[PDB]
Design brief:
Two copies of one chain form a homodimer. Chain A is an alpha/beta fold. Helix content of chain A is 51%, strand content 14%. Bound molecules: NADP nicotinamide-adenine-dinucleotide phosphate (2 copies). Chain A: InterPro entries: 6PGD_dom2, 6PGDH_NADP-bd, HIBADH-related, HIBADH-related_NP60_sf, NAD(P)-bd_dom_sf, RedAm-like_C.
Chain lengths: 285, 288
């Protein structure tokens, strides 16, 4: 099964590498042409149009959806007819949904994706690559695409999903790093080093993560039982976190933000509910 | 051993504590404002007439009540002699300043003092799931180490400062609220497309594990003043944070959290740490 890869930054190379390493006749193109991939078995290509004509499966990985626009919008109406396009460029759900409409009007199958791992992980069990789009676009190329890693996974029909998953993962990542930093600062005031702190906090991170499947069950019904842990009882402790932060002269913006949300929930009379009732705060504005 | 211990305060957590001390074979005296709050004296527990009697019963006294204002209310009125020669362990939640205050007070009252914090629910007490942090001087902790281990294998002594247990509790709490809020932001986003929280959860917990593994390394960076980019500099985060905001606004979900995240990164860029790795943001968390 021949496959084409458009875009050869760090990630584009990894992608092409995995397709060669899995035995695919692999055609390649980049703006700045120029090499190692053609030195393994890769056929290099003269233009974008030649790259697209080479394979029924076309993969795109460039910096943003503006670059995607730049390389794909100029193509002939016929160039994509009957082909499957897989766009692994990072972007928003709206960008993905747009390319899906565009690709449909250009007579093509389209999968929108997102890579959640570094270039080194591609082709291993560490790779996570999410795909969204219709089954008719994915099933025929499932074997080919599995070549990027066992973590290559199909999320469902709506082309917006990969983006949304990538967003949920990113906000969680920033949330954790910032929580960690707030912690290290606090403890640093008493001279405890970050490296002493870390093993403590990773144990705790694991504990909290185990609570989430249950919080998900609560969110999927509209049912937020207190379980001796109601939002009201969090409130006092959040004040302490703020007072402690202020008093030691570290930043308190994060603790104050945390208290703000809980106050809102109390103000809509959800004081008596479990923490996951805060989903309503995250749903509005 | 049959080494006697007293427990003052019998809310959910106070009961669990007293339960663990009985279950470990300790002659266990008990007191609560709302007396008869009973099942404990129905196991082998001796109940007590007043706070003073409870303190006179045991060389080891443990306190677990709602806040340090309550602690003030029950302990300040005692005679100067009532605590002489005893070890007081306060497992009430509070601030480092509240802990350091009681340590001074307890010292002037002729007592050894450990300040602690419980990081687990009542059910976990007496098991391997219990985490109970203790801080204070070795002289206060060593002679009662066996007794206190009876609360769980996760019972741990943090060192001399009477403020450390509070500070560890704070770090753990802020991390906990940070993760839950991240999770809720995610669920709201994915909810717009009809994907259920329970579908989402296994995806996010895989990721949480991946990020946690980065932290020992981030700690090493923070402990030197050295924040190398590792092909992942704060500048390169910046574009993506804008997308998270634009996505949030556009789908009509809350965007305060994504905006807050971008705010901090902007500050770091404005002090010319754009080129550094993410852990250079510790400086933002250390000021204002
Ligand atoms: N590497 C990672 O850590 C990682 C992880 C997950 C996802 N991703 C995503 O993968 C995608 C690719 O990133 P990358 O690793 O390739 O980083 P990158 O090196 O910045 O991307 C470079 C690729 O984009 C092309 N490009 C950029 N602007 C262009 C334009 N106006 N016209 C034509 N081509 C343009 C570059 O062509 P030139 O030859 O002209 O430079 C090159 O092919 C990005 O969405 C990135 O977010 C990356
Ligand atoms: N349970 C948990 O999930 C958990 C987890 C970690 C830490 N903790 C901590 O454990 C400590 C105790 O909380 P808990 O869960 O046992 O709370 P609780 O169910 O509110 O029990 C609170 C205790 O506070 C006492 N109290 C409050 N004000 C008082 C006063 N002015 N004078 C005398 N006694 C007073 C109550 O006695 P009355 O019954 O007579 O009112 C009761 O024994 C708290 O600091 C809490 O943060 C609890």
């Amino acid at each position: 099964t021949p496959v084409t890869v458009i875009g050869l930054g760090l990630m584009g190379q990894a992608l092409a590498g995995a397709f060669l390493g899995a035995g695919h006749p692999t055609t390649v193109w980049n703006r700045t042409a120029a090499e190692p991939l053609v030195a393994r078995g890769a056929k290099s290509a003269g233009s974008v149009a030649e790259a697209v004509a080479a394979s029924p499966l076309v993969v795109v990985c460039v910096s943003d959806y503006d670059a995607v626009h730049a390389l794909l919008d100029p193509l002939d109406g016929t160039a994509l007819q009957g082909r499957t396009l897989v766009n692994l460029t990072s972007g928003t759900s709206a960008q993905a949904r747009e390319r899906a409409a565009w690709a449909d009007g250009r007579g093509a199958d389209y999968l929108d994706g997102a890579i959640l791992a570094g270039p080194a992980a591609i082709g291993t069990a560490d790779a996570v690559v999410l795909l969204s789009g219709p089954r008719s676009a994915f099933d025929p190329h499932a074997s080919a695409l599995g070549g990027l890693g066992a973590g290559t996974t199909y999320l469902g029909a709506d082309h917006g999903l990969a983006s949304l998953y990538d967003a949920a993962g990113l906000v969680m990542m920033w949330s954790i790093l910032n929580g960690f930093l707030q912690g290290a600062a606090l403890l640093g005031t008493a001279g405890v080093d970050a490296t002493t702190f870390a093993p403590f906090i990773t144990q705790g991170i694991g504990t909290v993560a185990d609570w989430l499947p249950g919080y998900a069950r609560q969110i999927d019904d509209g049912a937020y039982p207190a379980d001796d842990a109601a939002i009201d009882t969090h409130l006092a402790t959040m004040e302490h976190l703020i007072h402690e932060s202020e008093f030691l002269g570290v930043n308190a913006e994060l603790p104050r933000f945390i208290k703000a949300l809980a106050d809102r929930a109390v103000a809509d009379g959800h004081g008596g509910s479990g923490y996951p009732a805060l989903i309503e705060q995250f749903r509005t504005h």
